[PDB]
Amino acid sequence: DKLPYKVADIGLAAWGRKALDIAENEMPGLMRMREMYSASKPLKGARIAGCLHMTVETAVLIETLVALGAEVRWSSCNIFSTQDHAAAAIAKAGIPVFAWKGETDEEYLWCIEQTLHFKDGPLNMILDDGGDLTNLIHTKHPQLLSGIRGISEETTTGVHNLYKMMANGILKVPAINVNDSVTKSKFDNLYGCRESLIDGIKRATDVMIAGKVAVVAGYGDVGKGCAQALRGFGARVIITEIDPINALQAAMEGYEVTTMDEACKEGNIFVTTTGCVDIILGRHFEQMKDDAIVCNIGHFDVEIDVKWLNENAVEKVNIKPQVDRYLLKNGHRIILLAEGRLVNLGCAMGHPSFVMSNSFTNQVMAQIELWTHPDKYPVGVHFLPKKLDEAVAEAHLGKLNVKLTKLTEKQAQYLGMPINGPFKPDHYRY
Amino acid sequence: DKLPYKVADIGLAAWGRKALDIAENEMPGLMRMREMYSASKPLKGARIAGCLHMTVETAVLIETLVALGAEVRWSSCNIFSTQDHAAAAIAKAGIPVFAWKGETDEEYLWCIEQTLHFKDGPLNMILDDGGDLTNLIHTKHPQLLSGIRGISEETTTGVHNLYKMMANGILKVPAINVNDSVTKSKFDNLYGCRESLIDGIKRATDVMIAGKVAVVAGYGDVGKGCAQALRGFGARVIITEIDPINALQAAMEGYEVTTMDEACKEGNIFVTTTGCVDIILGRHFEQMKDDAIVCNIGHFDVEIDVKWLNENAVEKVNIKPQVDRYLLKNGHRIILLAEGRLVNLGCAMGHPSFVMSNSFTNQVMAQIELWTHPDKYPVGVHFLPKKLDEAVAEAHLGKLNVKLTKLTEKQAQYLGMPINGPFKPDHYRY
Amino acid sequence: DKLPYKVADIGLAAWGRKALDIAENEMPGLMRMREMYSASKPLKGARIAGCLHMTVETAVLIETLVALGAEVRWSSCNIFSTQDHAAAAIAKAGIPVFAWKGETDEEYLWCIEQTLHFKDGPLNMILDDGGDLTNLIHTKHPQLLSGIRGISEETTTGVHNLYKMMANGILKVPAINVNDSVTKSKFDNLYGCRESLIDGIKRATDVMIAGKVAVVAGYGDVGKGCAQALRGFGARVIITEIDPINALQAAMEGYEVTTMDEACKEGNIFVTTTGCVDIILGRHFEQMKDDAIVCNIGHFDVEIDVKWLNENAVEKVNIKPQVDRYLLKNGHRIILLAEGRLVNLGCAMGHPSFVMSNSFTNQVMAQIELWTHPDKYPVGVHFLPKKLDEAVAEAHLGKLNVKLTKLTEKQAQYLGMPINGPFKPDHYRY
Amino acid sequence: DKLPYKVADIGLAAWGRKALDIAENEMPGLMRMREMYSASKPLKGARIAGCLHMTVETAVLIETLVALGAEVRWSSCNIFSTQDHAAAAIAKAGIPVFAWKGETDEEYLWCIEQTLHFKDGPLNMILDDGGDLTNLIHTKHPQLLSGIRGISEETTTGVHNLYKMMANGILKVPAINVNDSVTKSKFDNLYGCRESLIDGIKRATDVMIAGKVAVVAGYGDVGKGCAQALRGFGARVIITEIDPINALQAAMEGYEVTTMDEACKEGNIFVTTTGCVDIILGRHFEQMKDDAIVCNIGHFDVEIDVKWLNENAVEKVNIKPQVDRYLLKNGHRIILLAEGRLVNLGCAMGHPSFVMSNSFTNQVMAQIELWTHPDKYPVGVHFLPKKLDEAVAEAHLGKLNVKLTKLTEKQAQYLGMPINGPFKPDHYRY
Ligand SMILES: NC(=O)c1ccc[n+]([C@@H]2O[C@H](COP(=O)([O-])OP(=O)(O)OC[C@H]3O[C@@H](n4cnc5c(N)ncnc54)[C@H](O)[C@@H]3O)[C@@H](O)[C@H]2O)c1
Ligand SMILES: NC(=O)c1ccc[n+]([C@@H]2O[C@H](COP(=O)([O-])OP(=O)(O)OC[C@H]3O[C@@H](n4cnc5c(N)ncnc54)[C@H](O)[C@@H]3O)[C@@H](O)[C@H]2O)c1
Ligand SMILES: NC(=O)c1ccc[n+]([C@@H]2O[C@H](COP(=O)([O-])OP(=O)(O)OC[C@H]3O[C@@H](n4cnc5c(N)ncnc54)[C@H](O)[C@@H]3O)[C@@H](O)[C@H]2O)c1
Ligand SMILES: NC(=O)c1ccc[n+]([C@@H]2O[C@H](COP(=O)([O-])OP(=O)(O)OC[C@H]3O[C@@H](n4cnc5c(N)ncnc54)[C@H](O)[C@@H]3O)[C@@H](O)[C@H]2O)c1
Ligand SMILES: Nc1ncnc2c1ncn2C[C@@H](O)[C@@H](O)C(=O)O
Ligand SMILES: Nc1ncnc2c1ncn2C[C@@H](O)[C@@H](O)C(=O)O
Ligand SMILES: Nc1ncnc2c1ncn2C[C@@H](O)[C@@H](O)C(=O)O
Ligand SMILES: Nc1ncnc2c1ncn2C[C@@H](O)[C@@H](O)C(=O)O
């Protein structure tokens, strides 16, 4: 392609490598895939074009993929999710990375297109996060379609769209749904957001959660992780939902479940963990308490109506990067975070490295699968063998010094399951 | 058959009806099935033979099936799980129930056989809990097999066996796996045991949980619900597991995961939420602290080796029904509860009525499905349409005064899902 | 006096002794006071007249005081708090105990009077709980006043009145405020109620706490322990308070703080942990949801207006002992528990033995102080030396296998405190 | 004195004012003291010399004291606790502030001395945090002693020393113990550290708390707040203590209490909330797991032996400001945070503004008390009238939209307390 890469500051690499150094020791999964595959190099010959937030954790993923003999050209899947010191260490490392914190819609797309063509040919693999890359290609670069051996979607929103495509026979290349791995969804979205949400908020506003009424729209794994977090600091969490089953779980957990039409008048902190549009409108903004902290954590920023804020506020003042304090015609203030984009990543460092090793291990596996055994994955979104899913968890058990139990021949017989073989039926919801 | 029924005391009906009365107002699911089907009577012509713990909640289930025009002959699936006042109110009601608290292995089977034959013919339906009924029939009364239109397994253990039969083409009649409904598993096993576990313990030993090291074997929904409970009262919960994924969840929740071989020496309270044999042996008993409270909550009592206690204790003293205090040769005491059988049901009243309405609503539905649309269920275990699973949750939302959100035409479009249509993919693990 | 004792059933002693036997091993404090004072008998010559709920734990207190050479004549401080098997074991043991579950206001007083006179003289000591005994004497038997060496109040309500008397120079004998010992208040009222509250509720109504909105009046240690309990089972706890400091704590803990005038319309479970009158009136009852569970845990039953229920209900039906289901003219039902009296003791077994060993150890010490060193306690309510309060905690650490840290000569120097000497200033609120 | 002030960058004021602007709206206590005293100016004629961390919250305190007509000259009581943008906004405002993040022991003292002399005379008041100021004066500038109307200690460690002085007749000026106000200790130390602890850790190491064994030395309010925090994120918290009562509370809360001599081999995160020396030594360092995160939160950095790390490490590498990664001779790594100094303030922004309003309100009051009614405070440390302590809490209730309850004439009579008068006896431990 063009320039070898492009980032905010390459002089940040020296620092980023330190972050990467510390990060590596916290991601047993990726480092594990390295020891057993560094030599084998199952990814040899592969040209992976990724679109995942360019953070330090992702840096370890990229360096792992390369260790497996892959050829990588990266880009961030969010205009604010990029970590400039992490990206600097990667570029300085020779990996063509085109990502920097605070890009423009235009620069963002350029960065993505920058990863399509390699030295010895175009991308033959895709590691997407949000579907932006797989979508760009399917609708703008069809010519390259027939050459991509596979897709790797990591987020719910993207995987959601992955199915949509198939639903219309649009999907033209076999995909593996990584986000929906037990070790992925139940650990990353849930446990990660629990720790990364409050971070985005605090680093941004530095507000005290205790004694505040926080409103969470959506009760999925992210909504569950977020709620738990605020609730654990002393905030009264109110939940809004459209799914009766997800609504009951919340109620059963002691959370009040209402409509944003009602909650907007009580909330002090508004978090949208939904992947839907029109979650927080002006009809709610005009109802929010003075200095209400509004932010979104759902992948795409389509939940909060920021345009309204910008088109109906009496005044807009920027506190600091990704922190704007509007003044409504009613005299009430509204603190909008990260311009409505992902809050943990846009205002903080995102999920911690240990939990990202889970998702990323699934990512390294998904890639080896699609590349190594293509004929095993027809055009359509697939899941990773539970035996593999089990391999991910088992990989981080040691760092935590967990001592797992081993079934005896008699017990395994009793339960009618392999001492090591998958211990749960597919339908099992862990 | 023989006698109209048989119970501990029919003079307990007057009281049991009061229990049923209060119970009904707490089970919106069953009462809901009642209003829309009381007249329709979709179960008309059905002769359901049940094997589910005979409790007050189950009483509402029986009185619901009958309201649906079904013909019912019940029995308890546990020699200690029976609620004598509940069973009295049922028999006095005219429903042939053969269950009483404290049956013998002999009297237990007799009770089951008592439900096979009806006035106008043998059983044409099965509502089992544990597989005991479906197993008795398959291996002892094959003749009646071909007449049964379907099975309804309610517990993991049972459903586990349901699949085992199919695995060997033994299952000879279409079954519906109710235990594995989102509203069933994630609410009953998890939220029920959370509240019913400590109950069994307290009513039995009346011990203080706070400051005690409790050991929980198995981290399934029951293990999860139990752990959370003890943990919430001030006990240090230690978990043992064979599944790395379930072990990671525990660790990620702040629980120490080890082997019973290790934990036995530290635990003060032992709870087996596993469905496997040889969980607590004498090798551990000989290692337990003085006055260690050991109990099991897994359906079948196959986890704790009580025989060893009875064959190796220096002395056995019975504190009160279902509470025995053993004296080991090492001088240490061991308080065994409910003789190893289910603790919440054997020493307490079981799960509360509100949560049982979820499981039981699934049961009423499973029955209407198999009976009504039989040709839709070939020999093999099946799940209940997610639309239905949603119907269960949605039915208890109101009691909790939950205000669910309604997708707009635009949002539904965005999300690409019906405003009411199932909101989650099948693979969704809620 | 008259009859040696009087109880519900002496043939319940054989059982009670088993309860006592198990209870003893769980109360390291009392058993500890036993080993070092069994021979010394510092209470020798004392004639203690107690008025504390006659439970198994209290049984260990009585048998301990006696082991200390004391002469005891007991009675319960509540018409429902008595444990008949416990009381039987005591009577059968020779200790004049006049208490049985379900006394009448008349029989209750008779029982108290029955403890004033001993073989070798009238009572020379008082071990009260609620102030009922110390009040009766001060206002009805002044003649015996001058003979009593001291008082031992165990509950907040009582101690509250103890000061009230002094405030009016009414208190005529030195009292020791046991309820306000760090090991007493922060562990008994808080940790005991946390476990004993739900018990009284469950054993009585057997209702599911999860998903229910529970309302708690008062945020003292009892309110704190109760709230935490319900909240931990999945109930949405709402708190009402008059103290801004106790209200802030709640808010800071994520609890909604409102007025009963508002909460009554939302609560599903009403618990009064206040010690004040007119907490739950008919103005609220007329506003409660159908089948609302109302109960009180505050010592005296002066918070809930039951007369109103009995005078305004359309009908009153008794479910079982201490459980009445009223029917309001509006069609809604109200489940009143234990007739408004203490719920954990009236409907359950009360606090567990382990936590009761704390309060009771303080009680044994209070008695030894007043008796042994009288001249050290002038007329007026006093506290127990912190060194002693520390002795109590220290006594139960072992059972929990806690390994405390020992200050070094250098550290003790640094901190400027005795390696063992009281580690906290008097004003310290632990 | 010398220069008008001295800070890191005055070009940081513009931003700091925004921080102050948002902060003010979150501190109802201070802003409340402003409205009712802005005109009155009770502090008129006062020359307050402060030694408290120079943060945004403290900035609102300074601007409040001034609004009260006081004359202030500030300085930070920690070489790393200073917030440069906050200090900038203050200096730019005209208030002589001599503080900047990252001072030297020499520069630190210089800054303190800079606050002793004012335009119209030397300091006549003292607002200390840690006792550093009141100690410098007492031992180095005795001459100015006789002119100081009072002292205001804000932290436990400080107040601890305040008493020590008095214990030896060293304290030569009346002090008010602010740290020990109900609204101070139980809210700041507990609720603040809960939120500010994890911040310092995360912003420094960005580590995932979930699944990690965190070790907390000391179970005071700070230990309590810290433990709860980690515990709530999924980390297994182990506690070490010297006080049996504080140890029992922990045990009663489900925490394992042991010796650091034992925990050092299991902990993944070490937090010292103690105020004592020799808490974490090399004997423990040599026993810590690889990449063990060690940090202190106790006022003075005397708990962790960093010297040992610097004198026995094989290599020391600085990750970033206040983050150093040592390499032990055993191959294990140790991540030392903030060079052992306060972690929440040295690596994060400290306690949130809302909780700081409580402590600071008490500070504004302590100042008005000592200054206004001096003769009411003889030489010695005093507490703030509970009625006042109540005023603080009541001031923040509104922001939280808390609806307090009002005692009626009948209830206040029954309870025997003023409808508004202090609702708790002095000994009350809230
Ligand atoms: N920023 C991050 O670190 C991060 C990490 C993981 C996932 N995500 C993103 O967050 C989003 C949610 O992911 P998830 O795994 O929790 O999804 P999920 O499907 O489990 O849950 C989303 C929930 O939203 C609810 N919902 C939908 N429309 C709603 C509406 N109008 N009002 C209220 N609730 C509504 C749904 O019923 C569902 O339970 C996705 O876009 C995902 O890609 C972000
Ligand atoms: N008494 C009740 O109220 C009640 C309610 C629901 C279910 N149950 C019963 O409880 C049992 C558990 O049900 P569930 O839904 O939680 O099952 P589950 O399959 O979700 O979990 C059981 C767990 O045990 C673990 N396990 C298996 N063998 C083990 C061993 N040797 N050591 C440690 N862990 C081991 C498994 O890995 C698994 O995670 C079943 O028998 C079920 O029928 C009882
Ligand atoms: N049944 C038991 O096991 C048990 C155990 C301990 C104590 N108690 C009793 O419970 C009562 C509470 O004891 P405590 O130690 O927690 O007392 P406490 O003084 O600490 O707390 C009582 C709380 O009630 C609040 N309050 C007072 N009037 C109120 C009103 N009208 N509305 C709302 N809140 C109001 C007060 O502000 C206070 O915080 C006492 O009577 C005590 O003797 C019972
Ligand atoms: N950085 C901050 O934001 C912040 C906020 C409040 C307080 N503090 C400081 O933190 C320190 C703790 O304050 P606190 O109010 O919790 O004090 P505290 O007296 O309530 O508790 C300190 C605890 O340490 C325990 N302890 C003492 N020596 C010990 C040892 N060798 N091993 C184990 N435990 C030991 C004591 O028994 C006590 O329970 C003080 O120096 C205080 O000034 C810092
Ligand atoms: N450090 C991170 N690196 C990459 N992605 C991050 C990170 N933090 C949060 N997400 C969001 C993802 O967890 C989410 O998009 C997903 O994987 O579903
Ligand atoms: N009241 C009850 N009635 C019937 N079954 C009860 C009850 N309580 C617990 N179980 C056990 C079931 O939850 C379990 O067997 C299952 O359904 O899986
Ligand atoms: N087993 C019990 N024995 C005696 N009193 C009990 C018991 N359970 C609760 N209380 C109430 C006391 O905790 C309360 O009155 C107090 O001591 O404050
Ligand atoms: N923003 C802050 N301003 C001032 N002090 C802060 C702050 N955060 C933590 N402390 C520490 C104090 O809470 C502690 O020293 C105390 O007051 O006890």
Short mmCIF file of N, CA and C in Angstrom, two decimals, chain A residues 160 163-164 180 182 187 191 194 241-249 252-253 257-258 275-278 302 383 397 403-405 407 410-411 414-415 423-424 427-430, chain B residues 160 164 180 182 187 191 194 241-248 252-253 257-258 275-278 302 383 393 397 403-405 407 410-411 414-415 423-424 427-430:
data_model
loop_
_atom_site.label_atom_id
_atom_site.label_comp_id
_atom_site.label_asym_id
_atom_site.label_seq_id
_atom_site.Cartn_x
_atom_site.Cartn_y
_atom_site.Cartn_z
N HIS A 160 -24.16 -9.87 15.21
CA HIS A 160 -25.59 -9.65 14.97
C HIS A 160 -25.76 -9.42 13.46
N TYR A 163 -25.12 -12.39 10.99
CA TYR A 163 -26.27 -13.26 10.78
C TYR A 163 -27.24 -12.60 9.81
N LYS A 164 -27.44 -11.29 9.99
CA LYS A 164 -28.34 -10.52 9.13
C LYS A 164 -27.94 -10.74 7.67
N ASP A 180 -19.65 -14.90 20.72
CA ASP A 180 -20.57 -15.83 21.37
C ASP A 180 -19.95 -17.09 21.93
N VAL A 182 -18.44 -19.04 25.19
CA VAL A 182 -18.69 -18.93 26.62
C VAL A 182 -17.60 -18.11 27.29
N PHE A 187 -17.42 -13.56 29.94
CA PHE A 187 -16.25 -13.04 30.64
C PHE A 187 -15.81 -11.65 30.22
N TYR A 191 -17.59 -9.33 32.72
CA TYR A 191 -16.53 -8.99 33.67
C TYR A 191 -15.70 -7.78 33.25
N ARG A 194 -17.67 -4.46 33.67
CA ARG A 194 -17.84 -4.23 35.11
C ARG A 194 -16.68 -3.38 35.63
N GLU A 241 -35.57 -2.47 29.87
CA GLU A 241 -35.40 -3.59 28.95
C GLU A 241 -36.61 -3.87 28.08
N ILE A 242 -36.38 -4.60 26.99
CA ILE A 242 -37.43 -4.97 26.05
C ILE A 242 -37.65 -6.48 26.11
N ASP A 243 -36.67 -7.20 26.65
CA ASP A 243 -36.77 -8.65 26.79
C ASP A 243 -37.30 -9.00 28.17
N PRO A 244 -38.46 -9.68 28.23
CA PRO A 244 -39.04 -10.04 29.53
C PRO A 244 -38.15 -10.96 30.35
N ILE A 245 -37.39 -11.82 29.68
CA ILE A 245 -36.50 -12.75 30.37
C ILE A 245 -35.33 -12.01 30.99
N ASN A 246 -34.80 -11.04 30.25
CA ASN A 246 -33.67 -10.25 30.72
C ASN A 246 -34.18 -9.26 31.75
N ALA A 247 -35.48 -8.98 31.68
CA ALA A 247 -36.11 -8.05 32.61
C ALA A 247 -36.30 -8.74 33.96
N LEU A 248 -36.70 -10.00 33.92
CA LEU A 248 -36.92 -10.77 35.13
C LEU A 248 -35.61 -10.98 35.89
N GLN A 249 -34.54 -11.32 35.18
CA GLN A 249 -33.25 -11.53 35.81
C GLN A 249 -32.90 -10.31 36.64
N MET A 252 -35.12 -9.99 39.60
CA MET A 252 -34.72 -11.04 40.53
C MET A 252 -33.42 -10.68 41.25
N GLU A 253 -32.68 -9.72 40.70
CA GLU A 253 -31.42 -9.29 41.28
C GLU A 253 -31.60 -8.03 42.14
N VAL A 257 -36.91 -2.24 37.21
CA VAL A 257 -36.97 -2.22 35.76
C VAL A 257 -38.11 -1.32 35.31
N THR A 258 -37.77 -0.26 34.57
CA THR A 258 -38.76 0.68 34.06
C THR A 258 -38.44 1.10 32.62
N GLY A 275 -27.73 -2.04 21.88
CA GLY A 275 -27.09 -1.96 20.57
C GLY A 275 -28.12 -1.39 19.61
N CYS A 276 -29.12 -0.73 20.19
CA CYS A 276 -30.24 -0.16 19.46
C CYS A 276 -30.22 1.37 19.42
N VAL A 277 -30.98 1.92 18.48
CA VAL A 277 -31.07 3.37 18.29
C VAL A 277 -32.20 3.99 19.12
N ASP A 278 -32.12 5.31 19.29
CA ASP A 278 -33.11 6.09 20.02
C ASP A 278 -33.34 5.63 21.46
N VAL A 302 -25.25 4.77 18.53
CA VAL A 302 -26.53 4.97 17.87
C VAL A 302 -27.65 5.05 18.91
N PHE A 383 -19.49 -21.36 15.28
CA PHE A 383 -19.01 -21.24 16.65
C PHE A 383 -17.74 -22.07 16.77
N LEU A 397 -6.71 -20.38 34.10
CA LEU A 397 -6.92 -20.94 35.44
C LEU A 397 -5.63 -20.93 36.26
N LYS A 403 -7.15 -24.49 41.28
CA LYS A 403 -6.85 -25.91 41.26
C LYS A 403 -8.12 -26.64 40.85
N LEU A 404 -8.18 -27.00 39.57
CA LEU A 404 -9.33 -27.70 39.03
C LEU A 404 -9.34 -29.13 39.52
N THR A 405 -10.53 -29.73 39.51
CA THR A 405 -10.70 -31.10 39.95
C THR A 405 -10.70 -32.02 38.75
N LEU A 407 -11.97 -35.61 37.21
CA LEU A 407 -12.93 -36.70 37.33
C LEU A 407 -12.18 -38.03 37.38
N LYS A 410 -14.40 -43.74 37.58
CA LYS A 410 -15.73 -44.10 38.06
C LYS A 410 -16.72 -42.96 37.90
N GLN A 411 -16.31 -41.75 38.27
CA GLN A 411 -17.18 -40.59 38.16
C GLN A 411 -17.53 -40.31 36.70
N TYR A 414 -20.01 -42.66 35.70
CA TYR A 414 -21.28 -42.26 36.28
C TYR A 414 -21.93 -41.12 35.48
N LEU A 415 -21.19 -40.04 35.29
CA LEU A 415 -21.70 -38.88 34.55
C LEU A 415 -21.81 -39.18 33.07
N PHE A 423 -17.42 -30.97 29.11
CA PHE A 423 -18.24 -31.27 30.28
C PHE A 423 -19.64 -30.69 30.26
N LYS A 424 -20.00 -29.98 29.19
CA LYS A 424 -21.33 -29.40 29.12
C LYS A 424 -21.99 -29.57 27.76
N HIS A 427 -26.20 -26.73 24.37
CA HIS A 427 -27.24 -25.80 24.83
C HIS A 427 -26.97 -25.18 26.19
N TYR A 428 -26.00 -25.72 26.92
CA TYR A 428 -25.65 -25.21 28.25
C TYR A 428 -25.34 -23.71 28.21
N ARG A 429 -26.00 -22.95 29.08
CA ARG A 429 -25.83 -21.51 29.12
C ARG A 429 -24.84 -21.00 30.18
N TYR A 430 -23.98 -21.88 30.68
CA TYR A 430 -23.01 -21.51 31.71
C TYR A 430 -23.48 -20.36 32.60
N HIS B 160 -30.55 -35.03 31.97
CA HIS B 160 -29.24 -35.58 31.65
C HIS B 160 -29.45 -37.03 31.22
N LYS B 164 -29.23 -39.45 27.74
CA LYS B 164 -28.49 -40.70 27.81
C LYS B 164 -29.29 -41.82 27.15
N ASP B 180 -34.13 -27.08 31.09
CA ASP B 180 -33.26 -26.25 30.27
C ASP B 180 -33.92 -25.08 29.55
N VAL B 182 -34.69 -21.06 29.60
CA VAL B 182 -34.02 -19.93 30.22
C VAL B 182 -34.71 -19.55 31.52
N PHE B 187 -33.38 -19.28 36.64
CA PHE B 187 -34.20 -18.68 37.69
C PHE B 187 -34.50 -19.63 38.85
N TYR B 191 -31.81 -18.82 41.37
CA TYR B 191 -32.47 -17.97 42.35
C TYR B 191 -33.21 -18.72 43.45
N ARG B 194 -30.60 -20.28 45.97
CA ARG B 194 -29.99 -19.16 46.67
C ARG B 194 -30.77 -18.91 47.95
N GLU B 241 -14.41 -27.68 41.28
CA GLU B 241 -15.03 -27.95 39.98
C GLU B 241 -14.19 -28.83 39.07
N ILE B 242 -14.84 -29.33 38.01
CA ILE B 242 -14.19 -30.17 37.01
C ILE B 242 -14.22 -29.47 35.66
N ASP B 243 -15.07 -28.46 35.54
CA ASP B 243 -15.20 -27.70 34.31
C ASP B 243 -14.35 -26.44 34.42
N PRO B 244 -13.39 -26.26 33.49
CA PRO B 244 -12.54 -25.07 33.53
C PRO B 244 -13.32 -23.79 33.33
N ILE B 245 -14.33 -23.84 32.47
CA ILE B 245 -15.13 -22.65 32.20
C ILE B 245 -15.96 -22.23 33.41
N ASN B 246 -16.49 -23.20 34.14
CA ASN B 246 -17.28 -22.92 35.32
C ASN B 246 -16.35 -22.57 36.47
N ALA B 247 -15.11 -23.04 36.38
CA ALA B 247 -14.13 -22.78 37.41
C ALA B 247 -13.61 -21.36 37.26
N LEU B 248 -13.53 -20.89 36.02
CA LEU B 248 -13.05 -19.55 35.76
C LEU B 248 -14.08 -18.55 36.23
N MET B 252 -13.37 -15.64 38.77
CA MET B 252 -13.69 -14.29 38.34
C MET B 252 -14.69 -13.62 39.27
N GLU B 253 -15.30 -14.40 40.14
CA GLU B 253 -16.28 -13.88 41.09
C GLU B 253 -15.66 -13.72 42.48
N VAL B 257 -11.04 -21.62 44.06
CA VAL B 257 -11.38 -22.90 43.48
C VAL B 257 -10.27 -23.90 43.77
N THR B 258 -10.63 -24.97 44.47
CA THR B 258 -9.69 -26.03 44.82
C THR B 258 -10.35 -27.40 44.77
N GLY B 275 -23.99 -33.40 40.51
CA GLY B 275 -24.95 -34.46 40.25
C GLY B 275 -24.18 -35.75 40.06
N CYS B 276 -22.95 -35.75 40.58
CA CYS B 276 -22.02 -36.87 40.47
C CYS B 276 -21.73 -37.56 41.80
N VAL B 277 -21.30 -38.82 41.72
CA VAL B 277 -20.99 -39.63 42.89
C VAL B 277 -19.59 -39.39 43.44
N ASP B 278 -19.39 -39.84 44.68
CA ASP B 278 -18.11 -39.72 45.37
C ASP B 278 -17.56 -38.31 45.47
N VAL B 302 -26.19 -39.03 45.78
CA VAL B 302 -25.13 -39.93 45.36
C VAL B 302 -23.77 -39.28 45.57
N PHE B 383 -36.86 -28.75 23.29
CA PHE B 383 -36.91 -27.54 24.08
C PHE B 383 -38.21 -26.84 23.75
N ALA B 393 -41.45 -15.61 31.48
CA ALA B 393 -40.87 -14.44 32.12
C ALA B 393 -41.90 -13.33 32.13
N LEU B 397 -43.50 -10.62 35.33
CA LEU B 397 -43.01 -9.25 35.34
C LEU B 397 -44.00 -8.35 36.06
N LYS B 403 -41.76 -2.49 34.56
CA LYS B 403 -42.26 -1.78 33.39
C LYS B 403 -41.31 -2.05 32.23
N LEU B 404 -41.67 -3.01 31.39
CA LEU B 404 -40.85 -3.37 30.25
C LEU B 404 -40.93 -2.29 29.18
N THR B 405 -39.93 -2.26 28.31
CA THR B 405 -39.88 -1.30 27.22
C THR B 405 -40.42 -1.91 25.93
N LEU B 407 -40.25 -1.84 21.83
CA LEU B 407 -39.47 -1.42 20.68
C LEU B 407 -40.37 -0.63 19.75
N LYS B 410 -39.13 1.82 14.19
CA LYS B 410 -37.79 2.18 13.73
C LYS B 410 -36.71 1.33 14.39
N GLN B 411 -36.81 1.14 15.70
CA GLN B 411 -35.82 0.35 16.43
C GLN B 411 -35.86 -1.11 15.99
N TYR B 414 -34.16 -1.30 12.88
CA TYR B 414 -32.72 -1.21 13.11
C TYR B 414 -32.17 -2.56 13.58
N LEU B 415 -32.71 -3.04 14.69
CA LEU B 415 -32.28 -4.30 15.25
C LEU B 415 -32.62 -5.46 14.34
N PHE B 423 -36.51 -11.98 21.09
CA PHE B 423 -35.46 -10.96 21.09
C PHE B 423 -34.05 -11.51 21.16
N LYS B 424 -33.90 -12.82 21.30
CA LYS B 424 -32.56 -13.37 21.39
C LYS B 424 -32.36 -14.60 20.52
N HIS B 427 -28.89 -19.54 20.42
CA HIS B 427 -27.63 -19.78 21.13
C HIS B 427 -27.38 -18.85 22.30
N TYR B 428 -28.23 -17.83 22.44
CA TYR B 428 -28.11 -16.85 23.52
C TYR B 428 -28.12 -17.52 24.89
N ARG B 429 -27.13 -17.20 25.71
CA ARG B 429 -27.01 -17.78 27.04
C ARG B 429 -27.50 -16.89 28.19
N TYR B 430 -28.37 -15.94 27.87
CA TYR B 430 -28.93 -14.99 28.84
C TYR B 430 -28.04 -14.82 30.07
#
